[PDB]
């Protein structure tokens, strides 16, 4: 049982919204030991769905793994301008991951709530996502 985290700062969230496509991937982060398994984050600005069109979708993708499957629990959260966690989403259940398989939330955060300056979620037009993974 290994636990690690990864912070993803997306620059020019609104400024380069159209250059971001239907989906954009993040850099690959390891187990915190850099030995066997590699993950990355996959976010959908539009949600590519009718029910989640007003939402931003966030996923945890398993890039490479030595074994056949990997069971892991994940937790997504947004870091506000003062570094604090907000709008956290997670499932107490663990999920099976295979090379090229991903798990996440289609409706993770409302775009309206995200772009609202009152929530202080986009300082310097940067969206800072936080992910914590617990491999079993």
């Amino acid at each position: 049982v290994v636990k690690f985290s990864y912070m993803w700062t997306i620059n020019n969230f609104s400024f380069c919204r159209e250059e971001m496509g239907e989906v954009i991937k993040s850099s690959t982060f390891s187990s915190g030991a850099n030995d066997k398994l590699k993950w990355c984050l996959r976010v959908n600005p539009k949600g590519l769905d009718e029910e989640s069109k007003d939402y931003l979708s966030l996923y945890l993708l398993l890039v490479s793994c030595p074994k056949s499957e990997v069971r892991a629990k994940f937790k997504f959260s947004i870091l506000n301008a003062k570094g604090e966690e907000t709008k956290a989403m997670e499932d107490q259940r663990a999920y099976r991951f295979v090379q090229g398989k991903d798990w996440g939330f289609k409706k993770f955060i409302r775009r309206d709530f995200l772009l609202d300056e009152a929530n202080g979620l986009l300082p310097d037009d940067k969206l800072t996502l936080f992910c914590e993974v617990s491999v079993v």
Partner: peptide, 7 residues
Amino acid sequence: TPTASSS
């Protein structure tokens, strides 16, 4: 936990 999905 109910709320989760994949691609």
